[PDB]
């Protein structure tokens, strides 16, 4: 692992694994045979960390997921290895610029935002504190769709990130596995019989999941679907089959009830429990199985895993019924992620009688035994039953998958104190009455190696040489940042850090798109899904509002940044994306705001953008609608790279807030309570708009066509729904909102007490690390232990 | 190289190549680290090979089909880059068995027979000849199907042969290009225009073709198809772009006219004109095009290149007509494989104008030159414009591909004497007298190399200690064999290597099925696709004489081995195939005749299989009615490999015959001019029938359902054919072929003439070798020169 070898083994690659030479070799192929060679060190640990825990036997975790949000594995793989700085020095001598390099790797956008990125952040805290950690999902062969602005709306494309091969994956076809679908029951003598199936064949691919300095890589195994005139007919139908692992719902907080997004829900539940059946094998038999595993269900997508493992453990293992159901709810533990009542999962039980029959016989028996439970509890409370059971039958009977979760798991989390509070408390009462001790809080985190030391190698600098390396481990050892709040010196290395990420994401958005953007101007940014709850539409009401100020007294400048994806079917979402882009066009084009105010619609945000971005931002926007966001993710990664938070109390911004001191965030707007009251006095949006002459003007230029000359009426949708549907009071925060913008604008005149303020968030930030939310599964839930 | 240095290499690529270790490594695994330890060796001449081509600009030969029938790569690539004795030991020394891993290797069977076949052993025969040629076609990801036999049916299973990966391919992503479908034409003042075209892009993949010893490793460039709710529909339906490359269609001379299989064409085609356009360009600048390309068209099936280069030369490069014309003419050169009237490529116009409009107009144009010519040489014959016109109109319009073909190359050849004479003088009579010179032959040959040293190692052994290695490399040398035919001792070594062939395969036979073979019984194999025209129905005739002989009065026993795939929809050959396993079912059961005589339809015929029967082969039937094989290659590999033919006068049999002498091949039947008689006369296959006892019985019995006892009926439809609708005359041979069988069984009698004929055989194969069919290919058609 020194220079001279990693230059000899990139030039062997280049040669023996691409077959080319320096004269026709492609930026692509440079960046293949650097792949390779990094590769080349994760096998050893590989081998060795699998080999460990077969011959160790530690409980493993099998984090069971439809998504991980995985970004580019290049340069987080070098740093965890502690290969970078050889590998930057080996490809300098090559004449090659590593950056370019690796550029050229696709994001594995196999997720929609935070929950993907959730899990992708825990593969990497559980591999870096060395628990038996698996991640069990499927390989999409289409991701996250790009995202492209074509006059001014957003246009999908294709995201088919394994066109020119995944270095990354290793194909397990020895563990190929069958998976049923459709069918019928046969309760025969011999047991019950599903039968008559059609059969999907799973094939695993292995990706390396290396954990940061520490000879453990752990493995993260996807799921790719494969078929088992009118000959060539039946050979193209394999497509059919292969459809499954096709592509990603590109859903985020939006409940689709496709049948084939059914059918990914089972493939990868029913591959995975197999693939784990068969592991605890080859280690009364399942007497230990509890002990030797623990699956988490992210969120209720994997939901159907319960009904599996009791059709395995019944239908084939012979266990009596119940035996197999206690056995199952010690295995699995789930988390919550949900609170808007559309992303709710409730699957028509015609759907699911159809594909999964034996699935909705095992469903029903659960939830019989459910309420004989109940009645029994309560023999008069009538109204309890219908309210826990598994099937709501309300024209049309549909399976709420969430209760499902809840009576087959020991362990319901939430991602977020109020969240979970919420999800306890109030959605799931009648259950945590019942089972007080089985929801629990599992705070979210990010880890600080892909959002600290891979996108900001400057702060994670400044941070080592005062305060060491130990931070990276330890995130809480962030808080000896403290002993530097009156280093002047200090703070402007701090500054100088941003500053610098700044102006390398200015030539980014300018080599990106025809803006002059003022480097000296604060970075306003708001980055994730586009939806109404997370009220960008609010953000760009604030636009507009400063864009009318600079008209009429033609300030703190400042280069506003709003991006994210829609889900195709979103339409509100994409009528939000071209009022961004439409009011985008008049600020940026209008001679007398000039460099006062520009705004970009930062193009298809993900994983490897949001490295980009977030690192160079100064104000950070975190202004769902209170109760809405159940944690949120980036406003921890805004939080861990300096930039400040301006944000309502919701989620996590609570704790953030908690962490860093209330005074020491920017936080406004009506907090849950507010929001009760306001439902329970009913929300009148029209008050406001009369009220806020601001805010009259920013809707009526809107209205009139001022943003769309064009075609004046084009933002009608928008309009009616601020006015008679906006289940998210956007006009009910505006006010204090824009109040708190401008207190964000004169903190800014003042770089000794904004960047001061930075500093305590910096500071504050451990608690977030990704490291310290699985420490607690770890203890609270899987019962494991690092290492 | 050497031993120690194999074996370092094996457990390196096992190690990081297959991430596995001795513990948990598959059979699969260490194919697979065997198969790059040997890919490793290949680079280096690979680069070198392409680099030399570039800076010597010698001519390039490009190989157009739509069939590449490679078979596996592993022992064909050791035993041309002389590494198979060092890789055997290294493997051996690693405990492992070399041909255990070598049976991991799954076919590359992009070929439906001899058409696809013939293009392999080219390509293998232009490496060892050091030509700077390529082989172009379509990577399909299934090639001719698996075969399997359920109650006595052919029944087909997809053949994905790249469900574990292909490591003898390598993508070229740099090198995709796009190619155009549907649309429409538009003549601007800019020039003609095909536009609103749907867009199909293509990939290509490299496989190293390495000539036997000597440094050269060319290129085989196969193409891959690759896409350019709502939104999940969209992504799903890349698959309709996609399904170009998807399936070989299995057709034996017989022609489909699907559009899908028009895309197929027009697809590998396009791709490959433009890259060959590209690469030439990267060497008035087209004047030297057909000095430095020539593209050989593998039948009909590429004949889109033509008018494709003619637009691309004309709409695109801009050159006149008449130019681009000349150029066309020089750069390609046409192989008829055809006689069958059902294997003729007849596109209806209709289709051919909505998918490639642009080259419908092309094709008209080029047919107005052409008639215009001939009505200015003939102007009173009218007859002979329409049967010079690439469209027949009588009743739905249709191009005539292999009318496009002659006038669009220099050169047309048919595939052995007998063929290319008809060919020449009959089928393309108007335009051979023409263009006489423009008509050639170009017998079959098959490589050596495959067909010898790999697939029978013993044979090649054995020849090489009594004359050397000169022979791998110029065939004709086994003419030398002749000092030996009064060589007792040979002729005993000679029989044994066949023994051992023979007890070899024997094993292989029981192990796959329930039949003890007589190992001294003479083998008498028909392995080749299933047509009507191959006659083995005929061969089955046969053995059914041969039962009702031992039947009769309980001889040389044998053990019939019949083998071939039937097309999907080729009912008939399905129907023999039954026919075939009834037969063998009663025969082999019969208690009567016990070891006297075996019957064996050999499943999934396919190229490694062939690469196993035929060594053990003592009878090789090559039955073919005459004027219906246009040559034939199996015939050729059973005589290098010390069978005996029994055959009509057709194809390469005849050459066959003309080489080693008529008396030592077992000729029999009609021939060619007989079988003209025989129509002039009108064939009433009844009369045979009731002349010939053998043969009523023979007839009777299968009619009765004496081979189908439970269906009585059904073979209903071969008795029919075989009385009224028998193209192939097939009772016409019976008897001459049931007394040529008799003699056979007589030499069979005496081993020492038996072995003295076969050495005759061997000794003047020679003339069959591809290294000599190529060699006349580049002297004669594309003026390119050997080394
Ligand atoms: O295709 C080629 N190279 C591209 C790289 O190969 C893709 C398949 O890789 C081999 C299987 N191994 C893995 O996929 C793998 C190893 C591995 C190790 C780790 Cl730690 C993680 C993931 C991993 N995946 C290729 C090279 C080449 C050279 C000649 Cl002469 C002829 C054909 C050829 N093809
Ligand atoms: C972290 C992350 C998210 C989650 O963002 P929120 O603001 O927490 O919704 C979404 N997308 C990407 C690409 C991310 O990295
Ligand atoms: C050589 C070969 C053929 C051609 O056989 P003929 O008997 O010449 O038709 C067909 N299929 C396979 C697998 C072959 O190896
Ligand atoms: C169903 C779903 O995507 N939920 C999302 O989950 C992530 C990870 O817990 C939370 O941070 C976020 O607030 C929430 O919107
Ligand atoms: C259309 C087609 O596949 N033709 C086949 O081509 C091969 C190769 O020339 C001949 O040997 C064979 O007799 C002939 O039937």
Redesign the interface.
Known sequence: ENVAELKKSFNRHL??TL???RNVA?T?DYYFALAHTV??HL??R??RTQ?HYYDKCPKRVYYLSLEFYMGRTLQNTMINLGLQNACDEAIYQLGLDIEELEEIEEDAGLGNGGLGRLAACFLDSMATLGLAAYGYGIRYE?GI?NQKIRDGWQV?E?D?WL???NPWE??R??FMLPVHFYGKVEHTNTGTKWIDTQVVLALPY?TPVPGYMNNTVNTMRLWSA??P????Q???D??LAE?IS??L??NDNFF?G?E?RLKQEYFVVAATLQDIIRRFKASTVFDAFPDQVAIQLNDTHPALAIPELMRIFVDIEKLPWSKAWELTQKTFAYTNHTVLPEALERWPVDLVEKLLPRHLEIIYEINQKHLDRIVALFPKDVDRLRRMSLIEEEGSKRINMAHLCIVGSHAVNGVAKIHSDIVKTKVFKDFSELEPDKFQNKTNGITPRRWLLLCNPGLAELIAEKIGEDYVKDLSQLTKLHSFLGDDVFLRELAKVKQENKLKFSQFLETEYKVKINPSSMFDVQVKRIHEYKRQLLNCLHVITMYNRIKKDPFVPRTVIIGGKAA??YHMAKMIIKLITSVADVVNNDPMVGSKLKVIFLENYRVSLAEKVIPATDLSEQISTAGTEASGTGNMKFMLNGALTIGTMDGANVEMAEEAGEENLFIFGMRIDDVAALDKKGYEAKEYYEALPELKLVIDQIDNGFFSPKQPDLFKDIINMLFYHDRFKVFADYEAYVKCQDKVSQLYMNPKAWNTMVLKNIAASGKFSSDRTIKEYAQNIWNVEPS
């Not at 005139?229 to 060539?232: E, N, R, V």
């Open positions: 040669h023996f077959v080319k030479d492609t692509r590769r080349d096998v050893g590989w081998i080999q289409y769709f999908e294709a088919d066109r020119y091969g290793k194909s076809p020895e292995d494969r078929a005139g009118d000959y060539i039946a050979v193209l394999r497509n459809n096709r592509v719902y590109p689709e496709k084939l195709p079917g």
